[PDB]
Scaffold this active site. Structure first.
Site, PDB file in Angstrom:
ATOM      1  N   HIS A  88      22.972 -76.962 -31.238  1.00  0.00           N
ATOM      2  CA  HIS A  88      23.072 -76.857 -32.503  1.00  0.00           C
ATOM      3  C   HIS A  88      22.075 -75.488 -32.819  1.00  0.00           C
ATOM      4  CE1 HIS A  88      18.582 -78.778 -31.779  1.00  0.00           C
ATOM      5  NE2 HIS A  88      18.742 -78.046 -33.011  1.00  0.00           N
ATOM      6  N   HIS A 105      19.899 -74.038 -34.552  1.00  0.00           N
ATOM      7  CA  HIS A 105      18.515 -73.759 -35.003  1.00  0.00           C
ATOM      8  C   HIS A 105      17.880 -72.546 -34.225  1.00  0.00           C
ATOM      9  CE1 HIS A 105      17.428 -77.697 -37.130  1.00  0.00           C
ATOM     10  NE2 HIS A 105      17.833 -76.900 -37.918  1.00  0.00           N
ATOM     11  N   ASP A 116      15.404 -72.243 -32.281  1.00  0.00           N
ATOM     12  CA  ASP A 116      14.711 -72.372 -31.070  1.00  0.00           C
ATOM     13  C   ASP A 116      16.081 -72.484 -30.095  1.00  0.00           C
ATOM     14  OD1 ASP A 116      15.245 -74.904 -32.341  1.00  0.00           O
ATOM     15  OD2 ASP A 116      13.645 -75.697 -31.237  1.00  0.00           O
ATOM     16  N   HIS A 117      17.152 -72.888 -30.319  1.00  0.00           N
ATOM     17  CA  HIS A 117      18.296 -72.785 -29.265  1.00  0.00           C
ATOM     18  C   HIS A 117      19.364 -71.755 -29.387  1.00  0.00           C
ATOM     19  CE1 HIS A 117      16.256 -76.614 -28.740  1.00  0.00           C
ATOM     20  NE2 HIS A 117      16.451 -76.993 -29.978  1.00  0.00           N
ATOM     21  N   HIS A 166      20.761 -84.349 -36.092  1.00  0.00           N
ATOM     22  CA  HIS A 166      19.673 -83.279 -36.315  1.00  0.00           C
ATOM     23  C   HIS A 166      19.873 -82.210 -36.919  1.00  0.00           C
ATOM     24  CE1 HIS A 166      16.221 -81.251 -34.550  1.00  0.00           C
ATOM     25  NE2 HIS A 166      16.882 -80.253 -34.470  1.00  0.00           N
ATOM     26  N   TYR A 226      12.170 -85.227 -41.575  1.00  0.00           N
ATOM     27  CA  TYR A 226      13.266 -85.263 -42.440  1.00  0.00           C
ATOM     28  C   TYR A 226      13.197 -86.329 -43.168  1.00  0.00           C
ATOM     29  CZ  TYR A 226      16.063 -82.244 -38.904  1.00  0.00           C
ATOM     30  OH  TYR A 226      16.627 -81.290 -38.394  1.00  0.00           O
ATOM     31  N   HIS A 258      15.587 -79.690 -25.420  1.00  0.00           N
ATOM     32  CA  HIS A 258      14.254 -79.770 -25.050  1.00  0.00           C
ATOM     33  C   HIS A 258      14.217 -80.763 -23.853  1.00  0.00           C
ATOM     34  CE1 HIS A 258      12.694 -78.044 -28.912  1.00  0.00           C
ATOM     35  NE2 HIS A 258      13.661 -78.491 -29.444  1.00  0.00           N
TER      36      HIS A 258
HETATM   37  C1  LIG Z   1      11.942 -82.200 -31.598  1.00  0.00           C
HETATM   38  C2  LIG Z   1      11.916 -81.035 -32.226  1.00  0.00           C
HETATM   39  C3  LIG Z   1      10.796 -80.490 -32.870  1.00  0.00           C
HETATM   40  O1  LIG Z   1      10.740 -78.888 -32.575  1.00  0.00           O
HETATM   41  C4  LIG Z   1      11.999 -78.198 -32.876  1.00  0.00           C
HETATM   42  C5  LIG Z   1      12.475 -77.940 -34.409  1.00  0.00           C
HETATM   43  N1  LIG Z   1      10.993 -78.024 -35.312  1.00  0.00           N
HETATM   44  C6  LIG Z   1      10.125 -77.218 -35.023  1.00  0.00           C
HETATM   45  O2  LIG Z   1       9.936 -76.369 -34.090  1.00  0.00           O
HETATM   46  C7  LIG Z   1       8.936 -77.316 -35.878  1.00  0.00           C
HETATM   47  C8  LIG Z   1       8.472 -78.694 -36.627  1.00  0.00           C
HETATM   48  O3  LIG Z   1       9.607 -79.545 -36.936  1.00  0.00           O
HETATM   49  O4  LIG Z   1       7.433 -78.823 -36.716  1.00  0.00           O
HETATM   50  C9  LIG Z   1       8.839 -76.251 -37.104  1.00  0.00           C
HETATM   51  C10 LIG Z   1       8.071 -75.327 -37.189  1.00  0.00           C
HETATM   52  C11 LIG Z   1       7.916 -74.412 -38.312  1.00  0.00           C
HETATM   53  C12 LIG Z   1       8.999 -74.555 -39.038  1.00  0.00           C
HETATM   54  O5  LIG Z   1       9.229 -73.813 -40.176  1.00  0.00           O
HETATM   55  C13 LIG Z   1      10.143 -75.538 -39.091  1.00  0.00           C
HETATM   56  C14 LIG Z   1       9.893 -76.678 -38.142  1.00  0.00           C
HETATM   57  O6  LIG Z   1      12.898 -76.716 -34.465  1.00  0.00           O
HETATM   58  C15 LIG Z   1      13.358 -76.057 -35.783  1.00  0.00           C
HETATM   59  C16 LIG Z   1      13.319 -79.000 -35.012  1.00  0.00           C
HETATM   60  O7  LIG Z   1      14.419 -78.607 -35.157  1.00  0.00           O
HETATM   61  O8  LIG Z   1      12.793 -79.956 -35.639  1.00  0.00           O
HETATM   62  N2  LIG Z   1      13.219 -79.061 -32.194  1.00  0.00           N
HETATM   63  C17 LIG Z   1      13.504 -80.079 -32.023  1.00  0.00           C
HETATM   64  C18 LIG Z   1      14.579 -80.608 -31.552  1.00  0.00           C
HETATM   65  O9  LIG Z   1      14.714 -81.929 -31.349  1.00  0.00           O
HETATM   66  O10 LIG Z   1      15.612 -80.013 -31.549  1.00  0.00           O
HETATM   67 ZN   LIG Z   2      16.564 -78.334 -33.990  1.00  0.00          ZN
HETATM   68 ZN   LIG Z   3      14.703 -77.853 -31.011  1.00  0.00          ZN
END
Ligand SMILES: C=C1CO[C@H]([C@@](NC(=O)[C@H](C(=O)O)c2ccc(O)cc2)(OC)C(=O)O)N=C1C(=O)O
Ligand SMILES: [Zn+2]
Ligand SMILES: [Zn+2]
Ligand SMILES: C=C1CO[C@H]([C@@](NC(=O)[C@H](C(=O)O)c2ccc(O)cc2)(OC)C(=O)O)N=C1C(=O)O
Ligand SMILES: C=C1CO[C@H]([C@@](NC(=O)[C@H](C(=O)O)c2ccc(O)cc2)(OC)C(=O)O)N=C1C(=O)O
Ligand SMILES: C=C1CO[C@H]([C@@](NC(=O)[C@H](C(=O)O)c2ccc(O)cc2)(OC)C(=O)O)N=C1C(=O)O
Ligand SMILES: [Zn+2]
Ligand SMILES: [Zn+2]
Ligand SMILES: [Zn+2]
Ligand SMILES: [Zn+2]
Ligand SMILES: [Zn+2]
Ligand SMILES: [Zn+2]
Lengths: 266, 266, 266, 266
Positions: C83, C85, C87-88, C159, C190, C224
């Protein structure tokens, strides 16, 4: 010597290009397209909405009809789409340039619109039109309220991946009228079974017949008026023969089943 | 009744669509387009470069010629453009889909390519083609080196805002050959003076004649071979009559001056 | 006086940013990301595929690991995504600039990637990263074959709308190994019920648990690694504790049910 | 172990983020940004124009000031930009989502805005912000008239390739006031000489000093008010010390010459 073929224009039946004056559907809702292509103007105390524009060459005609309805270019706030083929989203780029209108569409429709309908899953590059960008991406079941007219998106993938029915409640005689603008459910010349570009096509069409069947639907309208038995040239009787959403869905499914059978044989 | 006109296809002289076999220009450089549209393949120990593709329907032909030259779809690394009109950038979207090729272009060319040549400053929507995205934006004078062939961009705005000459040094007989692929300098049917969509058009053309005049230019080639007096159908004599960059620039300026005079009179 | 707040950077646990050497999963498949973010390199006789890149700052590290594996920038042919986001898909724009790689993604992922993850349905603008364009749009169940490694897309919306599982069959010991790279099934913070930006969120998650449950799945990997019980820092035992697709799906559903209950109470 | 660095946020002096109430410049023109970032509202009998928005986090503040001026989201028709850096075009994506505003920009500014300022010629990915699409591409010297306020574009490439001065004539005391909103002419930390990403940088800056010098310019304003000696916190004296366009251009050139000398030495 044999040169490569000339480019071929996307040509359509004359009736699809035949201008008509605005035809009222309900208190706020007008057909402003051509005899055989739907373009719905919805007029609000807070600006207007257009659902579909028809063919690329219809832009000026639509603008003319909007003017006749009291709608200036500045007043047009939103364009919604059934699906992003040339015969429905054709003038969108030009309308964006010439009015205040922004486009809201699902991801699939946005992506197809942004490439001007080129690289179509079924039609190749034969129906390319001027590309446009979506200003807002909508999710299935998401609402867009404009001056108290609430439009709800119902995804009905098949004819295109991004095919959408739009529903809203207008009035007639102080009575609510639940209008369903349901997209096309045809699959003209499509490879239905084992299509590499659309592997779940059949499943999507089946789901879409069920979606259409279930719409809030006092009045059904469709991008090609003939598909729902509208006759825009018939004046006061234009919608007299219109199908219900149930009947439209059933006819489309029966046709689709026949097509599937013909394909297996072919 | 009178319906709106059908869409009209962008049609061209047959010779522009007449396939030809690869014609060698220098050790690494081949004309692989049609008799009357240039598409230059430059072959490197580190992959190939294509400068222009011609018309949209030429994609497969270009792929065929690349194959004859030893170039598979994976081997095509870079597409460069003179300008993003349908008769030069036409097959770019399809080439991107079918090969490894990425596109490098200036901002103006990228923006016009991304809208598939729609909303053209002079030609309206008449020459729309499948849109494509640029992968890299180049600045005036920027170099792109591919397997030691160094391509230099020289902006020459006029025919389009993003019109570019591309130069590189190939070899023949162990001698360097400075190839100048100069863009079009025509203004066919353009409003030159006081054009609201292009207020500095005349200044830009004047600057561009000077730019073209000054290019490193042992051999001039142009998108329309006739503009530089190439005859691709003439075999060993194909480039015998070719103009210098100086003569091409001067002829274009003299033509432009005549056009300006005719416009003032008209 | 009180100024508006400074922009806040997207910061992550250090382990997500901890470089690791390539860790082999099967004959052609390597983890080349960080200790806590998956980036899968699949090496083919016809070029390489990357599935995910992790965070924006990982681009150079990924390039380093590719080099260690025998993969030059030119050799990288395809990027696929779980996806879009930060971090990916974080380094995707940079990887496109620095390699031959093209991106294939569904419409939803493409649209989110093209806006650099801004205007996220749940996270607003907090996780913006450099935007990139998709080169190819994939449909649910569509295959992309690269050098005989066949990758199949399985949509698993939730997600993100565009969340995708990618499956392919590699080898170990002359035996087939069906690898399932299943996307995240979390919903961190969410709003699940009655979310105006995602009205069918719950239905989509439910469908996605079923999709994941049913994947061809000799070996499960996840964006992850902790989500599937991988420990990339554990060498020969890195995947020993890995969940099946069935167990991953069930754990995610049980968590989701708890979240739904907590939301109703909150 | 040493992980890769965390992402770093684009942080700015507090004064750049310090909200201020609307400050009137002329009959129709107001500064509505922060103490140290310009965002000009021009109010017309035919809707409003915004020139620049400042930083991404200023969107709501700008909306608040528009409301105080009598301008609702629907009333905002046009956004114009000096240049598409995060500290000037930062909130544009959000403003487009929350208002009726469309963006008009040159090709260079559009391309940089569309990638959210990522892959900046000088600043890499350090100043990425939410990307936005331009609705209209403007050429050098092109006019956009909104309710009889005529805005003229003057390209002044350097600080960014797409840097633009915007000029228009407002009134004060029944007397015309020719307002010049001239872009930045700084080159902070830039490699000026032999920059591969910007080979004609010096030539472009030189041309731009001349362009700025020659603007119709009863009143000069700049994106950073300090650059033209505005003090937005100084009330009735806010513009008392403002430079002429001539003096702004000369100071910028003298600074640039010093920088060029320092670079040669460094
Ligand atoms: C389980 C998580 C939580 O960490 C990351 C995530 N979230 C975060 O890294 C983190 C959070 O959810 O606390 C976050 C930090 C800062 C932000 O502005 C937004 C999100 O990445 C964007 C997300 O997609 O929810 N990704 C996952 C995932 O399942 O991919
Ligand atoms: Zn994500
Ligand atoms: Zn993630
Ligand atoms: C029932 C039809 C058939 O006519 C149009 C359509 N097709 C055509 O107009 C027509 C055709 O299918 O024969 C066509 C002509 C030329 C082409 O290059 C492609 C398609 O529009 C693109 C289509 O979507 O199938 N639209 C519908 C529809 O249901 O929306
Ligand atoms: C000299 C010409 C004329 O022919 C083409 C051109 N024009 C045409 O092919 C032709 C015309 O100018 O008459 C045309 C046909 C149909 C149209 O809708 C628009 C233009 O390509 C779009 C153009 O750019 O002017 N190209 C050049 C050129 O110099 O590149
Ligand atoms: C004079 C300056 C310096 O401050 C900003 C600028 N730079 C910075 O704010 C600042 C810097 O140059 O030190 C910066 C901080 C962090 C970064 O990652 C990049 C730049 O905005 C991006 C710039 O364009 O140079 N803008 C201008 C300007 O003239 O517009
Ligand atoms: Zn259709
Ligand atoms: Zn149709
Ligand atoms: Zn042309
Ligand atoms: Zn041409
Ligand atoms: Zn700046
Ligand atoms: Zn600045």
């Amino acid at each position: 010597e044999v040169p490569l073929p000339q480019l071929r224009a996307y040509t359509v039946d004359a009736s699809w290009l035949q201008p008509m004056a605005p035809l009222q559907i309900a208190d706020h809702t007008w057909q402003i397209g051509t005899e055989d292509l739907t373009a719905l103007l919805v007029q609000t105390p807070d600006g207007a909405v257009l659902l579909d524009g028809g063919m690329p060459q219809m832009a000026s005609h639509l603008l003319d009809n909007m003017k006749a309805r009291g709608v200036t270019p500045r007043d047009l706030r939103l364009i919604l789409l059934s699906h992003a083929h040339a015969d429905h989203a054709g003038p969108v780029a030009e309308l964006k340039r010439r009015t205040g209108a922004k486009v809201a569409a699902n991801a699939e429709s946005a992506v197809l619109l942004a490439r001007g309908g080129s690289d179509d899953l079924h039609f190749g590059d034969g129906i390319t039109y001027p590309p446009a960008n979506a200003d807002r991406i909508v999710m299935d079941g998401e609402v867009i309220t404009v001056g108290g007219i609430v439009f709800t998106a119902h995804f009905m993938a098949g004819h295109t991946p991004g095919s959408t029915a739009w529903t809203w409640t207008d009035t007639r005689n102080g009575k609510p009228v639940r209008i369903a603008y349901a997209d096309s459910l045809s699959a003209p010349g499509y490879q239905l079974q084992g299509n590499p570009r659309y592997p779940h096509l059949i499943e999507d069409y089946r789901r879409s017949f069920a979606t259409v069947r279930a719409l809030p639907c006092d009045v059904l309208l469709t991008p090609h008026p003939g598909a729902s038995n509208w006759d825009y040239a018939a004046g006061a009787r234009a919608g007299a023969k219109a199908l219900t959403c149930k009947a439209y869905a059933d006819a489309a499914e029966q046709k689709f089943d026949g097509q599937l059978a013909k394909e297996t044989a072919g």
